[PDB]
Amino acid sequence: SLQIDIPDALSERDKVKFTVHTKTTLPTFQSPEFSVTRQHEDFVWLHDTLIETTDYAGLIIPPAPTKPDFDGPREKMQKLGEGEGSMTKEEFAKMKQELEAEYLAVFKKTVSSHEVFLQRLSSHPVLSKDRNFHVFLEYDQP
């Protein structure tokens, strides 16, 4: 079996980090359980690479994940304090709490899109076997 989930993620400056966790029985992997850190572009790279593969001409590659956008929430958070002085402590806390809820919503949607893409790949009997997909899953220089 090939089981992939995204346990955790980080949003920073303008960059988003996903943790891609793999559980597998397959002999082809060096280890049964491992985790790596990947960025949205890495997901895009995999999709494009699968598309390029001559052998997969007759298969439909799963659509790439949507690029994550945290711009509204990040922009608001910077502004929030920012004007910490202007407002009361309860006002500040409630606002910070609100903006956090927003981050979480964006997180839930983007995490799902990235995870679903990987899960579709593992579903495919041919695609799961792909060498590039494997490297994406467990290559860890650090």
Binding site: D5, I6, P7, D8, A9, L10, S11, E12, R13, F70, P73, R74, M77, Q78, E100, Y103, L104, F107, K108, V111
Partner: peptide, 22 residues
Amino acid sequence: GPAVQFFKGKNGSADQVILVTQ
């Protein structure tokens, strides 16, 4: 502005977001 760290809930555990130094 701070980084935000997301933890997917260990179901049925709720998802969490935490403010990270940056």
